[PDB]
């Protein structure tokens, strides 16, 4: 009865996979960015611009704590930066939707800096993941992997 | 020969005012979010989402240091958030384009939401801009009027 939480970079297919999982499992699907924006009454971008990252993270940390009180399992897609929270593992079973950076950017040079930055972020998702899903085979292939792990 | 640095919330009119100052003073205009986005090749929103705020703020901190080395004064419009940087005040003379919450919101929606929480946090954020401002421009009453205020303070 643990929430299934999908983490990873924006554009990795977390929302599409969350909807498919909720359908396969007959469970409700939640999106943390959607909930924060709906409550605060500003878009995620507007929240960052007008109220700042620290306030966004506060709404996010508070929402994670709130969703943990829900005993019924939900599927939960999350925004890119959620992995900075200490309370993230704790929310439920986490899945890193692992996509090669090259595909992500279409949707990086060993000797320049940006690659290291993307690698460090990946290292954070992996550190916070119960399971790593290979996203390269597409949505149905990712679904199969998730279902097999939880079964 | 100090840079004229425009700070404030998104939608306050910083971009239009910067262009107008640039024209009036015959100076070049720079935008710090545009510089960062152009270099990284990701929108600001995309940097926060893909690389996180610590990285974004690192790019921004570095850029302020680099712009300080420009001798020739530029008008510089800045992103929300920039005032978090200890190195910001020294980049040049800062102008806070002050708006109230209701005006900001009005400019953004171009009624059932409870904005009480956002308002409370916004009012606290304003003090950070005020703290970091050489001058406060009443950004409630029109571009030309704002321009007039800035020109008078600098002249």
Q: How far is CA B1 from CA B25, B27, B75, B89, B151, in A?
A: 12, 11, 11, 15, 14
Nearest CB among A9, A44, A46 relative to B50 is that of A9
Smallest Cα distance from A99 to chain B, Å = 13
Contacts of A84 in chain B (CB under 8 A): 52
| Of B45, B47, B14, B46, nearest in space to B31 by CA | B14
Best residue of B121, B123, B127 to probe chain A, by most A CBs closer than 10 Å: B121
- Taking residue A40's Cβ as centre, other Cβ atoms within 10 Å add up to 22
Beta strands B29-31; B135-138: pairing state: unpaired
Spatial strand order in the sheet of B92-98: B29-31, B75-77, B3-7, B92-98, B135-138
**B59 vs A38: CA distance, rounded Å:** 30
Q: Which residues of A117-150 are buried (b: 16+ CB within 10 A; e: fewer)?
A: bbeebbebbeebbbebbebeeeeeebbebbeeee
Q: How far is CA B20 from CA B23, B28, B146, B148, in A?
A: 5, 11, 10, 10
**B150 vs B25: CA distance, rounded Å:** 11
Contacts of A9 in chain B (CB under 8 A): 49-50
Return the residue matching tokens 């500003």: A42
CATH class given for the domain over B1-155: alpha beta
Q: Which residues of B73-98 are buried (b: 16+ CB within 10 A; e: fewer)?
A: bbbbbbbbbbbbbeebbebbbbbbbb
State whether A52 and B113 contact (CB < 8 Å): no
CATH number of A1-151: 3.40.50.300
| Of B11, B16, B14, nearest in space to B105 by CA | B11
| Of A114, A10, A52, nearest in space to B59 by CA | A114
Structure tokens at B51: 């690389």
Resolution in A: 1.8
In total, chain B counts a number of residues equal to: 155
Structure tokens at B83: 């005032």
Domain boundaries, chain B: 1-155
Q: How was this structure determined?
A: X-ray
DSSP H or E run through B30: strand B29-31
| Of A115, A148, A146, A120, nearest in space to A14 by CA | A146
**B128 vs B32: CA distance, rounded Å:** 19
**B12 vs B120: CA distance, rounded Å:** 18
State whether B118 and A49 contact (CB < 8 Å): no
Structure tokens at B11: 């939608």
**Contact, B50 vs B73, CB < 8 A?**
no
């Amino acid at each position: 009865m643990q929430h299934l939480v999908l983490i990873g970079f924006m554009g990795s297919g977390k929302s599409s996979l969350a909807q498919e999982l909720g359908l396969a499992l007959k469970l409700e699907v939640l999106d943390t960015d959607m909930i924060i924006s709906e409550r605060v009454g500003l878009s995620v971008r507007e929240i960052f611009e007008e109220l700042g990252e620290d306030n966004f993270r506060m709404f996010e940390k508070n929402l994670i704590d709130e969703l943990k009180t829900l005993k019924t399992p939900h599927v939960i897609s999350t925004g890119g930066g959620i992995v900075m929270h200490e309370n993230l593992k704790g929310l439920g079973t986490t899945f890193y939707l692992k996509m090669d950076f090259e595909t992500l950017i279409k949707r990086l040079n060993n000797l320049t800096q940006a690659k290291e930055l993307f690698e460090k972020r990946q290292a954070l998702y992996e550190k916070n993941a119960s399971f790593i899903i290979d996203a390269r085979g597409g949505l149905n292939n990712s679904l199969k992997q998730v279902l097999q792990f939880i079964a």
